[PDB]
């Protein structure tokens, strides 16, 4: 089935700053991926993105009975939904799970790659740092960044390229909004 | 501290695929199941805390379909440009023997929103326990999607995420095994 396909997208966006305080609403319309016209809350009336949207902006601005709804969206749509859902989105807090283990690999020669896996946490804001017998290991540690599991939890692996010498202890420390105090996992 | 809620919707022809959903900071809150015409919250919890009348979504989709008729004609019948997806396979959490886990197949940066994903375990396909999401919007207006698979980690099992999409001239495969 190789018949042409034609895609239509619409995105009703609500941008929040300092909470439900300073808000901005966007009414965006797309043909494939090119947005062609949109209502910018900060602008007041639909503006044409590309020339393919010239007719749509002129047509909608005419109806001031319409322009009144979109101009009230920040309060009627955005701020309203933010309140309904902040209980379980904005305030959502999920404990991270920290596991430290030796890489089931070792691409680096005779150096042992130590992995610190932080799993199932929310929100996305988190901070993972490695420690050796006291002191931080800034160099020789790269991560996967933030990974989304798609089910409202994240994971991130912060690997550490270590040079093995028995008599040392390794500590992975995590600080997250859901934590009362840093989580720490040691590896001997 | 800064957040974003997006009500994204799309319509596809000649497939007549329609989608309506809410996205808060990159995660899905719910989408409306077009065939049954009932709302589906990503997490059961969301359900008893907030509600959405499906019927209001079919309304908008019906319009997106109407506007599509218009735009197609306007763009002088310009079809979309297939964009193949980059497939990455990974696990929900650190993997440990006989300890229930989840294999995730993340399909990214693609469009149009029509893909066919399959899970293979040592050759033959597996379909028990699997689950998936609808297409998630990306800021660049392409799409994402997740497919899950529960399993008991073994030493001899090699799992395969198989993805098909018009942008790929041939089906893709993404291997994953313990080691």
């Amino acid at each position: 089935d190789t018949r042409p396909r034609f895609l239509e997208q619409v995105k009703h966006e609500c941008h929040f700053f300092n909470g439900t305080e300073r808000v901005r609403f966007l009414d965006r319309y797309f043909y494939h991926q090119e947005e062609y016209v949109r209502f910018d809350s900060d602008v007041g009336e639909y503006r044409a993105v590309t020339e393919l949207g010239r007719p749509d902006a002129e047509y909608w601005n005419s109806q001031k009975d319409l322009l009144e709804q979109k101009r009230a969206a920040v309060d009627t749509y955005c701020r309203h939904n933010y309140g309904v859902g902040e209980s379980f989105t904005v305030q959502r807090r999920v404990y991270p799970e920290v596991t430290v283990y030796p890489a089931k690999t070792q691409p680096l020669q005779h150096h042992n790659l130590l992995v610190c896996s932080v799993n199932g946490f929310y929100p996305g804001s988190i901070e993972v740092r490695w420690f050796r017998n006291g002191q931080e290991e800034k160099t020789g540690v790269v991560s996967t960044g933030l990974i989304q599991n798609g089910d409202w939890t994240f994971q991130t692996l912060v690997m550490l390229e270590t040079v093995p010498r028995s008599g040392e202890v390794y500590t992975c420390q995590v600080e997250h909004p859901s934590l009362t105090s840093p989580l720490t996992v040691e590896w001997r | 501290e800064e957040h974003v809620i997006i009500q994204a919707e799309f319509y596809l022809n000649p497939d007549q695929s329609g989608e309506f959903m809410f996205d808060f900071d990159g995660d899905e809150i719910f989408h409306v199941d077009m065939a049954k015409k009932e709302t589906v919250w990503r997490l059961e919890e969301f359900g008893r805390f907030a509600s959405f009348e499906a019927q209001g979504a079919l309304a908008n989709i019906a319009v997106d379909k109407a506007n599509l008729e218009i735009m197609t004609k306007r763009s002088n019948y310009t079809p979309i440009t297939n964009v193949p997806p980059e497939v990455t396979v990974l696990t929900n959490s650190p993997v440990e023997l006989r300890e229930p886990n989840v294999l995730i197949c993340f399909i990214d940066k693609f469009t149009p929103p029509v893909v066919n994903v399959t899970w293979l375990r040592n050759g033959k396909p597996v379909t028990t326990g699997v689950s998936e999401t609808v297409f998630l919007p990306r800021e660049d207006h392409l799409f994402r999607k997740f497919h899950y698979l529960p399993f008991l980690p073994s030493t001899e099992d090699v799992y395969d995420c198989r993805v098909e999409h018009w942008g790929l001239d041939e089906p893709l495969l993404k291997h994953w095994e313990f080691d």
């Binding site: 009703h12 047509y59 909608w60 009627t76 309904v84 | 907030a50 959405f52 908008n60 319009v63 109407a66």
Partner: peptide, 13 residues
């Protein structure tokens, strides 16, 4: 409470 969908305006042909 419940989430309110924002309407998708129809274009003219």
């Amino acid at each position: 409470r419940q989430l309110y969908p924002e309407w998708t305006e129809a274009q003219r042909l």
